[PDB]
Design a protein around this ligand. Structure first.
Ligand SMILES: CCCCCCCCCCCCCCCC(=O)O
Ligand SMILES: CCCCCCCCCCCCCCCC(=O)O
Ligand SMILES: CCCCCCCCCCCCCC(=O)O
Ligand SMILES: CCCCCCCCCCCCCC(=O)O
Lengths: 279, 251, 59, 178, 279, 251, 59
């Protein structure tokens, strides 16, 4: 009622002696699609070894359970261009290369998400910088698909009555939250080999299934006499992860944020000849 | 299937996929010396896996005109791994052997080899009387060739093939532990030789325990192919080796 | 309402830690990074008939 | 190699000197160009430490009438890699006989002074060499091609493990993707 | 279930009276390598004394359980030289003399680590200093050996997806973390009398076994109109310590960070003569 | 009497009639590696009596002006009997040692020697920075001499005796396993060293496990005698040696 | 899940303190600076034959 109470280790090595028999563990046939399960004990004399190594750090939960940057953008407190005083990002995971490649090792994923925001500000250079400005405040707004979108820093849409938002003041700890599994399907799909229209026309690829919404950011009411620039960084961290259908890691460099397009690349590096073994 | 065999000694393995049975000496498997038969008093040394392993004894070519070859043991392994070092540093030695001979050819070749281990294969000189040095019949792992015609050089052994260099009919060597390599059927031969001698131990440099002979009874033949020769390879692994009487090296 | 479970070994080896949930949504919980079950047969042995390692494969 | 697919096949010929080397390579699964981009090297490159044994599987893709024997050896770390078959045969090795079974497995044992090895291997954590030599030679009957190919497969055993996650150096960008 | 329930003192002195016997506790032989175990009770009359002194503070856990500085470096928010805007330190414990000497009293050590970072900033002098700048933010990145290394303050490598990192804002408590025992061997080695190559050539000494990685630091996005300099200090604190094979403390001053090189030093100070006892 | 000792390893024996006790490492006796601490998988080789025996390590002269000597192990035995061969042919090794130092003189001589085994005796170069080859501190069984004055040659180690070549007070070497040879009382010293390292096994050519030092704290003196010098001899015997990782020789 | 143990004496001598672990890794725990066992025989008495202090050393 008050307190409820809730290791694997790799396989050991068994002692093996001399052998002379008709069994041939070493000989197999890869044509069957079967990976051989032989062990050193089956082809040479071995001693008894008790291993205590564990594969704890290789689990998908730990492999994908690290915060990684997915987007950064800059916005200014005051400027002549209205569009440059706030950000508007359509959520996707293909913008940054490292986390993209980590994710695309699997075809389908299902996880909760933990989002962290890091915001920093700096004064823009100019001929006159002497001013006194109190601490700034920022708003992060999440708009599910189909909702109204703000067109300027002081629009009515920023008065969220149903859209979740966060107000954060500089100098404190970074903002953070949790997000559940918000896919319409039974799992997220990194790849989609299909079209949007039923007659095989229109958009092609993963771009068709990206309908996660938008994120907007602004200075709440800060408007300094001299311009100030702020940068926001978004970090994603999967939780409670499950993965299906592994696929080989990518070899070619990425070139588009919403396409698989690539340039052909050599399989690997070369060496002097097939016998060269020295440095 | 009984045509597949696998042998594991030490850190080395031999696999054959088309082979005959295994011949075991005179029905006796190699074993260590017992307490009631030993004569030397000091403790023996038993390197085990360091010495009991397969060693590949160089290679030779089988031509249409080949007549035969022989190797003398344990001299053939005198400079091979730690077996040679233990031979050099010790006064006495004792070990059995596993001999594996590889020879493979297509289904369109023909030929037959006799593989036989001859204990105490004392040989006679080319010229009656006289004498020869210990280089006419053993110089390491190199193979020595028999001759079709009668030998004439006085510095070497009588290599006439049909007498096997021992004054006996070559056709009667079937009495010793032996096996045949017939290209229609098999591509390897395996013999396990126990330690055979009149004393419990002996010096491995002074005395040749046994001699391995490979003799083509049916000469090689083929037609219209790019393969001009059929290599033959010999592999040997000491078994249950133990040594005694440490001293300065060399021998 | 408090769970007690063992914590991973470390150097020098009460190896127990306590956890309580504060939020009403299961998505708010911390990562469950202590499950270590695995089974590679789905990718290494996808064949229909069982293959014995000591026996020859094809016939 | 003007053709990329030629990288995967190891040449073999009917007439060769009695002892000759087929191939040689360093056993650095996470650093060597041979193993760098394989399905095992890619996984290793996300980690800093590794340990355990490995499997190398060789498959003969010649004619059904071709035959031969090969010696495949693993030489633990040392001051000099083997130069001849006589040297190679002193280490761990297996004699491979080509027949109805097209494949043979060389299991590389875990012989090391430390429990773990660095993926960015240095001289302190060397792992040795692997070489293949002709044992008897390849023989063919009339009416067959004079050359054949072999392929190699690499995988980890059931005692393999990794440690210390890190970022892979194979992928990089210069500007934000759009 | 809710509550589980978990002193030594030095030896006492026993009363001793007059003695006259054949036993000679005072006479011994140092040639055996044996340190005499005599006590004052064995050579003079003593009273009974009950000691309550304990050797609690002499344990290796307490001796080495103090935070000590191991490295400091400076980096500027803005400058013309790219290499001077961030730090890159190969981790080692030989940089600072005091903790180095504390550690080298033992040959092998095994412990967990607690790392604390202290960061301070100051404005560089100049002809014009009037500016307004919000609070700065810093990033500390740890790159295990073999990982990618950043070449500039705004490189792609700073988007860690798997390398651990910390983001810290000025004005808060210093950053801190815990590190387990991350050696490939069974214990850390302060000394290594050996070579790198098998033929006794190459690097010599402890330098061969130092493969702990790197630490990188930068200002996240701060770039002030006028230069600002920041300094970082790294503190190490062993935990759960075990030590083997004690060795004598060093006598000569240190001269190299990766070598034992030294200059010969006198055994000790001198005095007027062997009988001088006055000040 | 407890002043007599006898030690029997392999086919060799040591007898001393005037000696002190025996020092055993850190209280630990040499032993084989256990199954729950090993890491290498293949079977080890244990030559036993072939390698675990006393080897005499050449001899030196003790003069009135001697300052001291050191030997580095196992390099000192790198070319000694079958121990050297096993070192050459194997990747990994592991063994404890028994060290016996002989020095005898009449009742009219005086002097004192410190015998100490220093694990991981890393040494610094004569010139700060720079570097030296693996010949300034180990060239086989030959002994290297300390120096009274500060070393100046950049190609060799800093041999200043009072620092012991390690930057530490020479008087504090008592912390390591040690023994004294005082000519009034004893003529030998015996130390048993277990295997000490941070890993279960290590390559015996790349790494020096420990260093033996002999240092005269009280210099030799005598008067009116025909004996001009007092020889010193060192004998060493590996214990519980085992090897792993066979490969081509050399190292 | 709470450990209760005595705390070191101090001036004027409930000498009990409570500890709970919050993290899943044993490396995160606080220092165990309350073990006071020691044995100097490994360095002071490394000889093979036991020596009696009252008896003469050599013979
Ligand atoms: C292929 C990637 C699928 C992963 C699913 C990502 C869904 C994004 C959910 C969070 C988006 C909005 C975050 C801001 C919320 C808030 O600040 O109000
Ligand atoms: C001889 C000294 C050995 C002690 C082992 C020290 C290992 C260093 C481990 C911590 C290094 C990285 C610390 C920064 C981590 C972080 O900020 O991400
Ligand atoms: C919103 C929940 C706040 C919980 C605060 C910490 C726990 C206080 C009660 C002590 C633990 C007992 C919990 C329980 O009875 O299950
Ligand atoms: C992550 C664990 C947070 C624990 C918070 C403090 C403890 C609250 C519960 C009161 C103590 C009871 C603990 C227990 O039942 O073992």
């Amino acid at each position: 009622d008050v307190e409820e109470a809730i290791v694997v280790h790799v396989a050991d090595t068994m002692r093996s002696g001399p052998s002379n028999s008709a069994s041939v563990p070493a000989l197999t046939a890869v044509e069957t699609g079967h990976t051989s399960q032989v062990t050193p004990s089956d082809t040479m004399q071995t001693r008894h070894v008790k291993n205590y190594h564990s594969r704890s750090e290789s689990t998908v939960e730990n492999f994908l359970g690290r915060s990684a940057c997915v987007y950064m953008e800059e916005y200014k407190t005051t400027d002549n261009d209205v569009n440059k005083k706030f950000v508007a990002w359509p959520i996707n995971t293909k913008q940054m290369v490292q986390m993209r490649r980590k994710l695309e090792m699997f075809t389908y994923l299902r996880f909760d998400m933990e989002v962290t925001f890091v915001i920093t500000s700096r004064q823009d250079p100019g001929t006159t910088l002497a001013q006194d400005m109190p601490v700034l405040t920022h708003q992060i707004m999440y708009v599910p698909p189909g909702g109204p979108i703000p067109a300027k820093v002081d629009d009515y849409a920023w008065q969220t009555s149903t859209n979740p938002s966060i107000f954060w003041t500089e100098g404190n700890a970074p903002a953070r939250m949790s997000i559940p599994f918000i896919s319409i399907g039974n799992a997220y799909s990194n790849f989609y080999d299909g079209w949007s229209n039923f007659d095989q026309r229109g958009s092609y690829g993963y771009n068709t299934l990206n309908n996660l919404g938008h994120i907007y950011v602004r200075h709440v009411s800060g408007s300094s006499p001299h311009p100030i620039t702020s940068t926001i960084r978004v970090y994603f961290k999967p939780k409670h992860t499950r993965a299906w259908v592994p696929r080989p890691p990518r070899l070619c460099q990425y070139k588009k944020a919403f396409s698989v397009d690539f340039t052909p690349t050599p399989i690997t590096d070369t060496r002097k000849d097939i016998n060269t073994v020295t440095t | 299937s009984d045509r597949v065999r696998s042998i594991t000694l030490g850190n080395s393995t031999i696999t054959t996929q088309e082979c005959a049975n295994v011949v075991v000496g005179y029905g006796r498997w190699p074993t260590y010396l017992r307490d009631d038969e030993a004569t030397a008093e000091d403790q023996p040394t038993q390197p085990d896996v360091a010495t009991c392993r397969f060693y590949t004894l160089d290679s030779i070519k089988w031509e249409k005109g080949s007549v035969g070859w022989w190797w003398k043991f344990p001299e053939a392994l005198s400079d091979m791994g730690l077996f040679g070092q233990n031979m050099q540093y010790h006064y006495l030695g004792r070990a059995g052997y596993t001999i594996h001979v590889q020879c493979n050819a297509s289904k369109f070749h023909q030929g037959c080899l006799l593989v036989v281990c001859v204990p105490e294969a004392e040989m006679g000189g080319a010229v009656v009387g006289q004498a020869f040095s210990a280089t006419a019949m053993a110089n390491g792992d190199k193979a020595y060739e028999f001759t079709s015609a009668t030998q004439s050089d006085q510095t070497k052994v009588q290599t006439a093939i049909h007498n096997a260099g021992m004054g006996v009919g070559v056709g009667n060597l079937t009495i010793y532990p032996h096996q045949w390599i017939n290209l229609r059927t098999n591509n390897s031969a395996t013999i396990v030789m126990p330690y055979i001698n009149s004393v419990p131990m002996d010096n491995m440099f002074r005395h040749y325990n046994f001699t391995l002979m490979v003799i083509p009874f049916v000469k090689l033949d083929y037609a219209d192919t790019a393969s001009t020769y059929v290599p033959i390879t010999v592999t040997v692994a000491p078994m249950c080796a133990e040594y005694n009487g440490l001293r300065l090296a060399q021998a | 309402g408090a769970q007690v479970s063992t914590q991973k070994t470390g150097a020098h080896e009460i190896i127990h830690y306590t956890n309580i949930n504060y939020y009403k949504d299961a998505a708010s919980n911390s990562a469950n990074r202590q499950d270590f079950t695995q089974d590679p047969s789905k990718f290494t042995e996808p064949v229909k008939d069982v293959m014995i390692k000591s026996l020859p494969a094809l016939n | 190699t003007t053709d990329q697919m030629e990288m995967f096949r190891i040449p073999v010929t009917i007439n060769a000197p009695l002892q000759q080397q087929v191939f040689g390579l360093r056993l650095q699964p996470g650093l060597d160009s041979v193993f760098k981009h394989t399905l095992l090297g890619e996984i290793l490159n996300y980690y800093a430490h590794w340990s355990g044994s490995m499997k190398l599987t060789f498959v003969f893709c010649g004619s059904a009438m071709a035959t031969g024997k090969f010696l495949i050896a693993y030489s633990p770390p040392g001051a000099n890699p083997p130069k001849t078959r006589k040297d190679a045969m002193l280490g761990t090795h297996i004699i491979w006989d080509i027949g109805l079974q097209s494949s043979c497995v060389l299991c590389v044992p875990w012989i090391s002074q430390t429990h773990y090895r660095l993926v960015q291997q240095d001289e302190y954590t060397s792992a040795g060499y692997v070489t293949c030599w002709y044992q008897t030679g390849m023989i063919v009957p009339p009416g067959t091609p004079n050359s054949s190919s072999i392929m190699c497969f690499a995988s980890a055993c059931n005692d393999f493990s990794v440690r210390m996650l890190r970022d892979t150096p194979f992928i990089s960008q210069d500007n934000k993707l759009q």
